[PDB]
Amino acid sequence: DLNRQTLDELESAPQTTRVRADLVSIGEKLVFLEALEKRIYAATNVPYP
Amino acid sequence: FETDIAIPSGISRPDAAALQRCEGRVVFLPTIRRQLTLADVAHESFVSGGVSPDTLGLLLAYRRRFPAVITRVLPTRIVACPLDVGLTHAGTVNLRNTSPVDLCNGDPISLVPPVFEDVRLDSLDLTLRFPVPLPSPLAREIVARLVARGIRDLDLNVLYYNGSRLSLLALGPVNAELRSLVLNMVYSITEGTTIILTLIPRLFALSAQDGYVNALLQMQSVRRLPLYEALVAWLTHAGQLGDTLALAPVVRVCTFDGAAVVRSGDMAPVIRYP
Amino acid sequence: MLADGFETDIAIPSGISRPDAAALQRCEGRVVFLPTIRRQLTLADVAHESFVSGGVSPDTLGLLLAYRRRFPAVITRVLPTRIVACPLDVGLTHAGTVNLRNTSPVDLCNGDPISLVPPVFEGQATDVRLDSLDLTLRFPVPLPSPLAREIVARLVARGIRDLNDLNVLYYNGSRLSLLADVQQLGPVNAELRSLVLNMVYSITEGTTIILTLIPRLFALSAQDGYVNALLQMQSVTREAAQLIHPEAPALMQDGERRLPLYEALVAWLTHAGQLGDTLALAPVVRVCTFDGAAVVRSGDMAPVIRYP
Amino acid sequence: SPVALHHQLKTGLHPGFGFTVVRQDRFVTENVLFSERASEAYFLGQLQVARHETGGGVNFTLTQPRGNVDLGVGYTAVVATATVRNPVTDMGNLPQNFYLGRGAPPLLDNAAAVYLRNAVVAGNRLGPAQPVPVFGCAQVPRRAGMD
Amino acid sequence: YLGRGAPPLLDNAAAVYLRNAVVAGNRLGPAQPVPVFGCAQVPRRAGMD
Amino acid sequence: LSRQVPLVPPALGANYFSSIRQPVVQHVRESAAGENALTYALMAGYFKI
Amino acid sequence: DHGQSDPSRAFAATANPWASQRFSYGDLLYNGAYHLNGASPVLSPCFKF
Amino acid sequence: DVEFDALLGSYCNTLSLVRFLELGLSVACVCTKFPELAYMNEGRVQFEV
Amino acid sequence: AAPAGPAADMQQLFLNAWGQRLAHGRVRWVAEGQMTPEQFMQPDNANLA
Amino acid sequence: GSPRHHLTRQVILTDLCQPNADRAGTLLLALRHPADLPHLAHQRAPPGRQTERLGEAWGQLMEATALGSGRAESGCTRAGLVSFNFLVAACAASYDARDAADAVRAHVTANYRGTRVGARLDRFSECLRAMVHTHVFPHEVMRFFGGLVSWVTQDELASVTAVCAGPQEAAHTGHPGRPRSAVILPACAFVDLDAELGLGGPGAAFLYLVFTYRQRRDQELCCVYVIKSQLPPRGLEPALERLFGRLRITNTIHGTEDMTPPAPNRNPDFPLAGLAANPQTPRCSAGQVTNPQFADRLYRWQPDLRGRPTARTCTYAAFAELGMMPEDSPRCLHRTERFGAVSVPVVILEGVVWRPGEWRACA
Known about the structure:
The structure is cut from a larger assembly and holds seven copies of chain A, two copies of chain B and one copy of chain J (363 residues). With 274 residues, chain B is α+β, with helices and mostly antiparallel strands. Chain B has helices at 13-18, 55-64, 136-153, 172-177, 179-199, 212-220, 231-244; strands at residues 3-6, 26-29, 36-37, 66-73, 77-82, 93-96, 108-109, 119-121, 126-128, 158-161, 164-167, 251-253, 267-271. In chain B, the strands form four sheets. A five-stranded mixed sheet of chain B has the order 2-4-5-1-3. In chain B, a hairpin with a 2-residue loop joins β10 (158-161) and β11 (164-167). Chain J starts with 5 loop residues before the first strand and ends with a strand. In chain J, strands 1, 5, 6, 8, 9, 11, 14 and 15 form an eight-stranded antiparallel sheet that branches. Chain J has a three-stranded antiparallel sheet with strand order 3-2-4. Chain J has helices spanning 37-43, 52-65, 84-90, 98-111, 118-133, 237-254, 272-275, 292-295, and strands at residues 6-13, 28-30, 81-83, 143-145, 147-154, 157-167, 183-186, 205-213, 222-229, 299-301, 317-325, 332-339, 342-349, 353-354, 359-361. In chain J, α1 runs antiparallel to α2 (52-65), α3 packs across α4 and α3 crosses α5. At the B-C interface, α3, α5, α6 and α7 of B face α4, α5, α6, α7 and α9 of C. Chain D: This is Major capsid protein. Chain B: One of its GO terms (molecular function) is structural molecule activity. Chain B: InterPro entries: Herpes_capsid_2 (IPR002690).
């Protein structure tokens, strides 16, 4: 056969928790909308990239 | 290995009998391909230019195209095999003369455009010019005759082969059809014999049977005239005609279980060089 | 020709580094000159160190002259231990199809004959060198046929200038030049003799009649434009006609029974028209694609079926 | 005269003439089709298997013969030219040479026929680099880069 | 005189004068004059003892 | 030829080795200003580089 | 190579006879290959041109 | 000294085996298959108006 | 040229020695006089380089 | 497992060839129909020779081929096949190994079925002595035809079966006792170029047919050689120049005769290198040429080519491809076989693969 059992599909699911993060649908798919100068780059002397 | 030349739709009733009469004849195609259209096969397929090509440009396309010999003719497609790749597998393919000249066993056969004197399909609006498969030792005679004819214009028509007589004259179009050959054959020689006459300016001046032989025996031992820029105008021009007027034979007849001399309208079996 | 093909086996030696073994697997279709038709040879026979004469590595012009004494072959496949080629002069394969690969600066077209040329171009003489064996493999350049009648005619005409510009070409509009180098006096005189034999042999007594047609052509190029753009702006016969009024001889000895115009043309075909085979080698090979294109591109393979 | 009108176009004079500059341009479009419930009878046959060897490789060229019967009394399909993509041809000013062409008679005085040709082709956007071949097809000097 | 690659003297009346006085009558020197390209040849000896 | 080009002999110095070339000569002929403007315009031309 | 024209404006060779061609006044001042202004720390903007 | 090289995962594709009758174009056909077509000359379809 | 002889027949020595020189090719700097500045930028001349 | 070959059959009279005396595996040669021969000799010959000599030499041959059994000279069916052992013994008075040459003629004038066989050889070789003089060369007339595998016998005609293309050792003979053949050649023609150049290296080799001429006033010769060489077809012209160059020296000086040169030397130097220098020389334009009031002021120039030793009259050799030996080392033998009661110096070429080719003059 060509289409075998793909290697990664043999694993199990990991454990999951609930994370608060904004979600926007643009087009036909879900996208995280996330600004990253509050958790990271808060009062540290590193320029925002 | 047999290709297919499909006939497009709308064939009249005499024209299905007209293509029934070119059973074993030589045809040129661009590229060896298992399917091909008849409009790429006809005489229209290389009238490219604004004048329909004369006998010179016919020769040039015949070395850029790949000759095929027609097998059976189905009323939907013309089945053919080419003379370069299809004949190593299948051994021997029949061939019909359109020549006024009969074939012997063991001759090699070149092809000549129809300079002597042509199926037209008015359901499809095309002509089908076909080459003349004459034997190759006549090819360096007959073309050399017809070039020599036009030089008289600015005795000759006697030819014998196989105990027969040939008359090339059989006048109007053919001299005008062969104007471009005559105007290159002269130019190459007159360019040659003046550059040779310029490099060694004594080649007409030595005594022929007395001093010129010493000038031959030495050759055998091992403003401005733009002369050295004009070799290239001669050498590339002369190096081009050495292929076109070569008329290399694709075809040699090996007769087996048949007559020794194959006449006009008959069929002669054909092999390539193995 | 044999039924089961005929493939010589150029041997690869023992000690070859990985920077060299992957340098020979890019030699998939090239032109390789066997000196004989032995089924077993070595790379020391193929390479340019076997090409040299007594210690004088010749020029590009002699490199023309020592191809016509060898047998050009085309690699079909490269094993780790031997290189397999097929000689062009004997027989191709069962198929009659051997894939090449264009080294040319010029793309091909269907049906065009290939005569091969030494690496004359500038920025182009790229020799695959083996370092762990100390060899240079000069790969010649397959070109279309009316190019090979130009470039051989450029080089022989250049060497005559040294015996007392030119090196600019054009083909399909792409400007290309060739390498200027001093030419040794030896092999150039082997070209000049091969000219003047085939040049004088095309002069029969019948050419005294054709040389009295020059006043017709110089008046014919006045009316038909086909004869204007035939002669050239840079030709000899135009300035020859403006000074010479030729006239025919009176009679011929026994000239009734013989055709003087016919003998001059038969001798012209086999001697002066044949000249493109004497200087260069023979156009063994043309390109006969099966499905691909009208144009075969540079750096691409091409199926090949033989030719006179 | 073509010698005389060479001078008065270089020197900015207006002679008694006008011209109609004509060119052709090719655009890229996006089309929309509409057909109907049965616009074409489509008969397909049975496949063939072929076999031919090339360059060591062995081609299996597969074919299948087919048929197009158009069972429409009248029109059954429409192209709808909707939008325009990139125009292909640049809308520049490329003058046309006839020195590429061949078949016109020359002027007679051959000290003067070289004068025009080495003053029109000499530094031209299109004119032939090599002189024109007597039976080939003359070539156009290939640009170093298109824009 | 077997070899090749040294400049001969200018007087061609005198360059042949040595060659017809050294190679003429030799155990080694060639019978035919030298081929212009590759490798001169030794004459065929009828006997080796 | 006497009417278009000047006929200066190089026993009195030629064009490229003098100090006033050809394009001052033609500027005399192809100006459309008058007589009160060229007198300053020529003086405007002899400021050295 | 000024046998051909400017690709951008296809009807002329360039827009500067003093800055486009080789060994010109445009080249002699602003090439790292000539090194006239390699010493100064001030960034000349046309160095990438 | 201890060294590696790594080959982490081998990624492939799955070809999209499109059936023609899974397409919305297939209205405009009437596809009835022939077991033979090459045995046929010009055939006809009649129409009456 | 260096000043030869008296100034009297200085020009007669010019025109009797320089008649064949003025008729080889056209003078450069006079041909740059009837040049429109939107012709001069084009590759029509061979004096751009 | 049989390799691909191509057989021929042709109903051929046994006048000049005999597939009974010459066994299975000799060469053959096709001919043109001889009605073309002395009409071309009337046409192509250089000025001042006896053109009817070919029509009279070939006349006396056919006329001596019967002399009896009431037989017509013209015929519908005509022998155009000359066997190879007939051709070598025709020109057998022009070799070096004459003692082996008469050992070819010893079975030619004996083993042939016929009455007064040798009266043809004094005539047919004179016909080849008329081919060269009447200048229709036999390589323009001869042509290769394949090597024998069988023969079916009748009085004065037979069914010649040959191999026109392929390997020689592949075609069935007819007798299953000895079902193949070998190429069998006399040793008076098979001259190598391996040891004669020094090429002792092994490799595949080519076989050629080579003719030689000698153009003099009624002192004219002929030879046939079958040469084995490791040389290219493009690279034979220097190697044949090395051997037969003495015949080239004779032909260029004694081949041109009875032509009348213009007396004395009339044609001057060609002055176009000097006429193009002055701009003060008179010229002409494209309409002024072919006008009598303008052409008289041009340069008059009357070229007189008479008595030049042309290329067509300086031919010393002509060759053609015949076949190759694809073996690693070419395996030749040298034996003497028994043609009845005559034993012959015989070269047995083995493993020959046939490829014919065109002719090529070495002028």
